[PDB]
A paper describes a structure:
The insulin receptor (IR) is a member of the receptor tyrosine kinase (RTK) family and a key regulator of metabolic homeostasis. The extracellular α-chain is composed of a leucine-rich repeat (L1), a cysteine-rich region (CR), L2, fibronectin type III (FnIII-1), FnIII-2α, an insert domain (IDα), and the C-terminus of the α-chain (αCT). The β-chain contains extracellular IDβ, FnIII-2β and FnIII-3, transmembrane (TM) helix, intracellular juxtamembrane (JM), tyrosine kinase (TK), and C-terminal domains. IR autophosphorylation on intracellular tyrosine residues stimulates two major signaling pathways: the AKT pathway initiated from insulin receptor substrate 1 (IRS1) and the mitogen-activated protein kinase (MAPK) pathway initiated from SHC-transforming protein 1 (SHC1).
The IR-A43 aptamer (A43) is a positive allosteric modulator that enhances IR activation by stabilizing insulin binding. To understand how A43 stabilizes the insulin-bound IR, we prepared the complex of the IR dimer, A43, and insulin (IRA43+Ins), and determined the structure at 3.62 Å resolution. One A43 aptamer and one insulin bind at each site of the IR dimer, forming an asymmetric Γ-shaped structure. The central feature of the IRA43+Ins complex is the presence of αCT helices bound to the L1 domain in both A43- and insulin-bound sites. The two αCT helices form a linearly elongated bridge in the opposite direction to their C-terminal tails, connected by a disulfide bond on the insert domains. A43 fits snugly into the site formed by CR, L2, and FnIII-1′ opposite the insulin-binding module. Moreover, the IRA43+Ins structure is nearly identical to the single insulin-bound IR structure. Thus, these results indicate that A43 potentiates the single insulin binding of the Γ-shaped conformation by stabilizing the interaction between αCT′ and L1 opposite the insulin-binding module, and single insulin binding to IR is sufficient to fully activate it. Structural comparison of apo-IR and IRA43+Ins by aligning the CR domains showed that binding of A43 to the apo-IR structure involved significant steric crashes with L2 and FnIII-1′. This indicates that the insulin-bound Γ-shaped structure of IR is more favorable for A43 binding than the apo-IR structure, which explains the mutual positive cooperativity between insulin and A4323,24,30. IRA43+Ins has one major structure in which the FnIII-3 ends are 26 Å apart.
Numbering used by the authors:
A (entry chain B): 3 to 27
B (entry chain A): 1 to 21
C (entry chain F): 4 to 160, 168 to 653, 683 to 718, 756 to 907
D (entry chain E): 1 to 160, 169 to 655, 683 to 713, 756 to 907
DNA sequence: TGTATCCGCAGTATCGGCATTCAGCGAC
């Protein structure tokens, strides 16, 4: 379906950049 | 934000590689 | 022999009881009840010796001071029972000061059963053989009398005795009149005093036998003073007990016509029957009172005033009883009522062709329009202004317009109008406009789009079940997983089921009221999303508390929260029908067993409470219970004879689906904030019956009978726990006489040996001997010879005997009765 | 001693564990501490990282999805106060999606000053129900502790804090497995408390070192100044961040430090009223050198220039960014989803704005009761509008009831059209009063304000009806009220009449919600009467209620039903509720009467009060009567055949209704026929349930009947009777005979015997049993009954052997047997 | 000096009727 919502997106956008890590100001 | 452009519309891998480093 | 009075109802005074002074056969029900201020001395000079026959029933409830009923109705013979009081043809209830029944002449309660309950002094109830009176003895309810303890002295006058359930006791109504029993060669016709049989056409009794013109209660029909099998032309049967000519049935008509039609039955003539009202598919003529066939359900026809008939409440709907077409229109507007789904359907659930406009404005208590059971055409020759032909605004509870799987409805002219209906959704209107023919022959409807179909959902998808595995008591069932595009919107599944033995049940049926339900609802939590369409995840439920072999109707619907656009998702599956399996039944209830000969038992029982399937047959075993051997050791001439709740209200549902969106908004705020982008015994098998005539038996030997009810036979049959009952056979009379002359032996010291031989086939046991020596001209002294004395001595040693000739009578008392005395045993010495 | 470290700015730690290296030298943290999103960690790393010397966290603490943290004890073993000056969606402590967390561990936390706590979606959390948050927070009802592993009792919950009774149970309170939640006595409420039971100085919190000293505690309360902490810090110093006091060199350093406008972080800190505030409010302006702000030259507001063209308000952390603003330069959309009640922290934050410039869309708010938090709103200009030229837009508010108080308020909308849909508790008078008061009067299109969907669950009328004649009977009740007509008499659809039963007069007024479940008003409808074209006529309508049970209190009221339209009239009228009770009838039958015999004189009897008393039962009434024995037991020979010896909804099939139909049919045959119809030793038994009767004849039978009875001395009216047959227990020495029996000798060897019949038996002597005995044989006996005893005058013996025979004589009654006599010898010699 | 709103019950209850009862204007 790829309407990723809820905990689905926080588990599924770790997997796209699991080596670098998240970004903030 | 991210839930507004990824739970009311579809998202590409380029659009959600924008959120980390 | 007398007049034919009608049915009365006497209460609170005895003066109305004088109106039975002259009548003989009552063409009605007799009912004496509720007399408080009555003295018991006001019943000695009160007697009705002419009452012969009652045709409806007899009820006798709480008459203070009535001692016995044998001085009040001394000549009842036939209670017909063409009409009954709760399937009870004789009710005697809460009657105090009543000692015995004493109706010593009634011979045949034709159709029904007796109920005698809650009396405080009613003796003489265990000495009445109801199976010689009640032709259906199985279902009389006789409890809580004086005889709840074995206490009352029901002594008896020489009067014949028969077995009922083993207890071989005597039969009598009172202590002065016993039950008139007849041999079974005169089954219901009634025999005279000598025992020779009567004519084969009258019932109960007859004054002189073999003549049908002198009988006192006729069973088939009574014509011109005589019994008649079936009445000749041109007579008509009337109330199925007598026969009248044309002028009586006819005359009766104007009788009612002239009486406000208030308490009379307009009698019509049909198939030589004076019928109260002739049934459907038939019309009454007005010339000669016959009832003529009409093709199909024939029109009323039903005109009305000024074209408009505002149906305010159900009483306004009482003018349309059985109309077929309407030469006008209809405007229904109902707000409240009780049992409204039944009353409106019974009133106007037969209307077919409306020749105007239908209009359902402001009906608040209408949940569905399904009570128009036979509506087929709305012609529309008079339209509502604006050219409308189905006008519908402001129906607060309308949900279901019709059942569009099994219906058809043509509006030949006019348009539609559907405004301000909250619960009625767009799918029913869009289905009606293409099943009636108004989107064709194109005619512009005026249907608002935003104010139809709120607080509900009808743009749904559909679920599909996948695994229905049934058992004898439980059913587990699983369906496809469902996920809305934002997967936290789904709150849970709701599963409705209801027992339905037919296949016409739909969703919104049975409530017809405020928020009620006839279904049974359970809730299912949503499953776990394993982020994969191919997983073992799809939910299901296990219904437990069911009944075997029935048809259940089952469907399931989701419970999603409202999106912030007024867009409700969800899916309700189709109504499915499932059937549980079979199970071995319960025991056959209350078996009874009366005998009628020396080697026969008949049985009567009931079919079981829960059959749990089509019962194919029964099974019955009988075994012998020989003799109670501990009865062998009693001297009988000393004293006598030894023998979970879950309601879901509006406030709870709204609180639940508000909290289940508050949590979603908090984690949506969290995901917005934290993510920043970058720039053995024999047997018998009886089928489809409730009786059995056993044969080939020993006389007066108690049998034990086991009963089985067995539903499936061919694939390795199974059935129930056996029901146990006992039975006895009526003994033969001849088999107790002493065979041969009784031998005397004279010893010198004035003790004599009187020996005899026991009869070669007794009935049960021979318990005592009565020997009687007497000098002719002198008194008699009785001697009881015990079983033990005869067993030790092989005779009797009679002490205290002066010399001389003596007449000696010998008898042997068994468990049945007396046999006969022997010859006078003369041992003589010449003086 | 108080704070031995360094005041620390707000931090944010993610994606590693090295960034915690700057948390070893911070005792207070101005700002917030978020530790979140560490996916690849192991529990071996957290055991040797400990921050033992932080005390005060001023804003909040968010731990969202940190893997490898099992206990929170060794991380923060010393934080006492979470102040909560800038919250996070009303919550000052958010523990979210901690997967590896076992215990809460925060054993030294005392005071959460402002805010609540939300602990949600943990899979392995326990020791959660033994914390007593009511001694930690100051407001408990806004918490959210839901969806943990403590939904089911499976995680221990054993611990060795005097087991408070703040709920209806007796539960111990404990943070961890080896620590308990520190509770001390309440002679000082929350003023700091030392462990051994002595209260320390009042201006401190939590732990203390020595009592009655405000110089050596650990967490002050009001402010803090250089070792001590006083209530009002002296004016060589100024207030700062509402917890410190600093001199003006520091505020000047901050101002001249971040006046270099290269970043968007700080504020231009000014001094005002001894407060180093970020910006002093409207009506003030800052001189450059002095750093204070003086009153403004005339009136000047603080324009709150809104980002992105609109602002949505969800909670406290979004309503705190409009703090002190006066005019808003953009639209404001109020949306408070879910919630319990939030009208207390909105009024102190956004209850000072005066001119919004866009619209005020109020949608989906569930916990809103009134808009009274908009305290000083006056002008809605509407330069930017909504889709369709709207300025006030209320849509789907489940609990809105009152917009303002129009007796003491003013509001002007310049342009645009107002909109009102789905407000199902809001009366129609409020929006029409708003159209009257405000500037918009005729700028509507039909239909914009939905006249049908508002106020349908709130009965809202202004006129009232009065009842003129209330007649009362025992079954039916009569009503007749005063006529009512709207100014257009063709606009009336009829009355509605609600009635219910309630024995207690504390019935609340009707709330609009038509009750339907179990406790509900029954509603009937009345058609409107016929127009009589005259003032004084038959215009009084009426009604007659028929199915009512006698002697109970009924609460009734009436209401009208009219059709709304464009004219602001025909609201309707509604009477106040009244209470009428019906009359009393004859009562029911006394239920379940049992008679129990114990001795030869006592008989006890009990029953139950009837099912339908129909009034307060005054007294019962018991009559009894001596039945005599059967005369047919007097003239029979009784050693023939026969001897006497007296003494969830569970929905099933409703096809069983016919037996109860029989019983209720005879009960209604009582009632429908008793609408028309109204020496013996007795006693007026009053206020009892059992009865003893002593001192009567033995073994005889009595018929007894009992009635219940209501009010007595004027016109005695009791029910129908109930009948019981009773029999007492027998006596021992009644049928036994004493005295010498006498034998008489006849010449024809028929021997006569004389005895006495017993003078009183237990009921009736029925047989005499004489037996004679010799030595060697058994006893041979003989029947004799009353007729043979009378006609033989004793008993005669026929034809026995000569010698000496012993005689033994019994008597048996219908109750049983008696004993023998002395064996007397009768002898003949030959 | 009488006359005069039923709404859904009454029950062996079919088609059109009447219970329930405090009241003073309108002709007769």
């Amino acid at each position: 379906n790829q309407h990723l919502c809820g905990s689905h997106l926080v588990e599924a956008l770790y997997l796209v950049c699991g080596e670098r890590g998240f970004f903030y100001t | 934000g991210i839930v507004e452009q990824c739970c009311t519309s579809i998202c590409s891998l380029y659009q959600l590689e924008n959120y980390c480093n | 022999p007398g007049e034919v009075c009608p049915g009365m109802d006497i209460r609170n005074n005895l003066t109305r009881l004088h109106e039975l002074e002259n009548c003989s056969v009552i063409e009605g029900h007799l009912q004496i009840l509720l007399m408080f201020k009555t003295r018991p001395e006001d019943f000695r000079d009160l007697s009705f010796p002419k009452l012969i026959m009652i045709t409806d029933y007899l009820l006798l409830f709480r008459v203070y001071g009535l001692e016995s009923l044998k001085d009040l109705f001394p000549n009842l013979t036939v209670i017909r029972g063409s009409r009954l009081f709760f399937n009870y043809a004789l009710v005697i209830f809460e009657m105090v000061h009543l000692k015995e029944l004493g109706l010593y002449n009634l011979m045949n309660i034709t159709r029904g059963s007796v109920r005698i309950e809650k009396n405080n002094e009613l003796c003489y109830l265990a000495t009445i053989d109801w199976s010689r009176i009640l032709d259906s003895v199985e279902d009389n309810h006789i409890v809580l009398n004086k005889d709840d303890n074995e206490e009352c002295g029901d002594i008896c006058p020489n009067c014949p005795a028969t077995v009922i359930n083993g207890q071989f006791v005597e039969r009598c109504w009172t202590h002065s009149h016993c039950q008139k029993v007849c041999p079974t060669i005169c089954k219901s016709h009634g025999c005279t005093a000598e025992g020779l049989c009567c004519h084969s056409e009258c019932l109960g009794n007859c004054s002189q036998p073999d003549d049908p013109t002198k009988c006192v209660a006729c069973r088939n029909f009574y014509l011109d003073g005589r019994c008649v099998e079936t009445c000749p032309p041109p007579y008509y049967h009337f109330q199925d007990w007598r026969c009248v000519n044309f002028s009586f049935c006819q005359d009766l008509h104007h009788k009612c016509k002239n009486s406000r039609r208030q308490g009379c039955h307009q009698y019509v003539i049909h198939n030589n029957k004076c019928i109260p009202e002739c049934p459907s598919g038939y019309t009454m003529n007005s010339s000669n009172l016959l009832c003529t066939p009409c093709l199909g359900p024939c029109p009323k026809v039903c005109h009305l005033l000024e074209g408009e008939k505002t149906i305010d409440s159900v009483t306004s709907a009482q003018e349309l009883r059985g109309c077929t077409v309407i030469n006008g229109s209809l405007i229904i507007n109902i707000r409240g009522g009780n049992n409204l789904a039944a009353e409106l359907e019974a009133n106007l659930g037969l209307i077919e062709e409306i020749s105007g406009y239908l209009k359902i404005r402001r009906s608040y208590a209408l949940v569905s329009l399904s009570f128009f059971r036979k509506l087929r055409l709305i012609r529309g020759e008079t339209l509502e202004i604006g050219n409308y032909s189905f006008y519908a605004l402001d129906n607060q509870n309308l949900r279901q317009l019709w059942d569009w799987s099994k219906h058809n409805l043509t509006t030949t002219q006019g348009k539609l109008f559907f405004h301000y209906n909250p619960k009625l959704c767009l799918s029913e209107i869009h289905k009606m406009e293409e099943v009636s023919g108004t989107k064709g022959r194109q005619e512009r409807n005026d249907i608002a789009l935003k104010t139809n179909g709120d607080k509900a959902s009808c743009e749904n998808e559909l679920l599909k079940f996948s695994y229905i595995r049934t058992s004898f008591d439980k059913i587990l069932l699983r369906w496809e997983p469902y996920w809305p595009p934002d997967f936290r919107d789904l709150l849970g599944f709701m599963l409705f089921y209801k027992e339905a033995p037919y296949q016409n049940v739909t969703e919104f049926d049975g409530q017809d009221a405020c928020g009620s339900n006839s279904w049974t609802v359970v809730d299912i939590d949503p499953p776990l999303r394993s982020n994969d369409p191919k997983s073992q995840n799809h939910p299901g439920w296990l219904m437990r508390g069911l009944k075997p072999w029935t048809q259940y109707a089952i469907f399931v619907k989701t419970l999603v929260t409202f999106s912030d656009e007024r867009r409700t998702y969800g899916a309700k599956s189709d109504i499915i029908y499932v059937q549980t399996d079979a199970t071995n039944p319960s025991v056959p209830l209350d078996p009874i067993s009366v005998s009628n000969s020396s080697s026969q038992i008949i049985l009567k029982w009931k079919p079981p409470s829960d059959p749990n399937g089509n019962i194919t047959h029964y099974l019955v075993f009988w075994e012998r219970q020989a003799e109670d051997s501990e009865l062998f050791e009693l001297d009988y001439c000393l004293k006598g004879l030894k023998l979970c709740s879950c309601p879901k209200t509006d406030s709870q549902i709204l609180k639940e689906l508000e909290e289940s969106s508050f949590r979603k908004t908090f984690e949506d705020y969290l995901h917005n904030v934290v993510f920043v982008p970058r720039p053995h015994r024999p047997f018998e098998k009886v089928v489809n019956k409730e009786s059995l005539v056993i044969s080939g038996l020993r006389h007066f030997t108690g049998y034990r009978i086991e009963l089985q009810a067995c539903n499936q036979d061919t694939p390795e049959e199974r059935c129930s726990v056996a029901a146990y009952v006992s039975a006895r056979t009526m003994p033969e009379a001849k088999a107790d006489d002493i065979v041969g002359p009784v031998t005397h032996e004279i010893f010198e010291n004035n003790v004599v040996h009187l020996m005899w031989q026991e009869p070669k086939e007794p009935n049960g046991l021979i318990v005592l001997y009565e020997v009687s020596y007497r000098r002719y001209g002198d008194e008699e002294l009785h001697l009881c010879v015990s079983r033990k004395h005869f067993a030790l001595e092989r005779g009797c040693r009679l002490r205290g005997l002066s010399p001389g000739n003596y007449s000696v009578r010998i008898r042997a008392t068994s468990l049945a009765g007396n046999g006969s005395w022997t010859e006078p045993t003369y041992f003589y010495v010449t003086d």
